[PDB]
Amino acid sequence: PRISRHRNSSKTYSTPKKPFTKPRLDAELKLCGEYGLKCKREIYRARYMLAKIRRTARNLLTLDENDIKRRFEGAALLRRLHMLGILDEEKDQLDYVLGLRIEDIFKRRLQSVIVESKLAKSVHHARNMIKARHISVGGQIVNIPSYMVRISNTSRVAIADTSS
C-alpha cells in the first residue's frame, strides 16, 4: 500500500470530565489573562504534559533508590527538566518533581521570556510582534508564540537583525 499509512499520529490534550465548574472557569480565565492564551486548548496541553511527567515520577518513585532502572530514568528526567528550565538547578531529588505546577511550564514560553527581559510591554504586545517575525533566538528567527526556550538559550534571545 501507500507508505503514508505507516505514519504515526496522536492527540495532545485532555478535556475535563466535568465541564461546568465555577472555580475552574474562573481560574482558567485568570490564567488566560495573565499569560495571554489564545484558547483553552493550551491549558489542556499543559495539563497533559504535567500528567505525563507526574506519572513517570510516580512510577520511578515506587521503586528502591539503588535500582538501576530507577537511577537511569530519574537521571534522564532530571536532566531534561533542568535543560528545559521547568525545575530549578538546586533541586536534584525526584520528590521535588511531583510538586510542580503548570505555571512553571507557562513561564518558559517565548512571550514570557521576552516580556521579563523588558523587550515587550505586555504579553499581547509580545504575541503581536512574534506573529510579525520581529524576534530571533540565537541566529534564527522563530514566529511560534508557544516555542519553548532552553536555559542556555535565554541570554541568546534578541531582536531580529533584519527586523525593521
Partner: protein, 122 residues
C-alpha cells in the same frame, strides 16, 4: 550586498565513478545568492567550471542558511556516462526531445500485438 561564503564538507574520493562527493553550505545573511550558476565558481576554487553539478539545495527558515550537494567530475566523458538524463537536461548540456504520451505508446503496443506475421503497417 553582504559577501557570500561557500564551504566544503564530507569530502570523499570516488575514483570508481571518477568524481568527488560533496555537501555545499552557502551563507548569505540578509541577502540571496542569485542562483547556483553564479555560485559554481566558489565551489570550483574551493575544490573546469562545467564539470560540476549542483542538485540538492534547500533554504532554511529565515533565509540565513542554504545547504546542498555538488559533484565534481574528473573529465567531461565521465559526466556523460555517469549522470541521470534529467540532470543533464536541467544543466545546459544536451537537448530534451519532445515528450510523447505513454498512453499512445501502450495503444500502439497492443494494436501491434493484435496483428500477426508482419505488423509494421500499424
Amino acid at each position: 550586498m553582504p559577501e557570500i561564503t561557500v564551504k566544503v564538507r564530507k569530502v570523499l574520493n570516488n575514483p570508481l565513478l571518477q568524481r568527488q562527493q560533496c555537501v555545499v553550505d552557502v551563507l548569505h545573511p540578509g541577502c540571496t545568492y542569485e542562483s547556483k550558476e553564479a555560485i559554481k565558481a566558489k565551489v570550483a576554487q574551493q575544490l573546469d567550471q562545467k564539470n560540476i553539478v549542483l542538485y540538492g539545495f534547500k533554504t532554511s527558515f529565515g533565509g540565513g542558511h542554504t545547504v546542498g550537494f555538488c559533484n565534481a567530475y574528473q573529465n567531461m566523458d565521465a559526466l556523460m556516462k555517469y549522470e541521470p538524463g534529467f540532470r543533464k537536461i536541467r544543466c545546459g548540456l544536451i537537448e530534451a526531445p519532445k515528450p510523447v504520451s505513454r498512453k499512445q505508446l501502450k495503444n500502439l503496443k497492443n494494436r501491434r500485438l493484435k496483428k500477426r506475421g508482419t505488423e509494421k503497417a500499424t
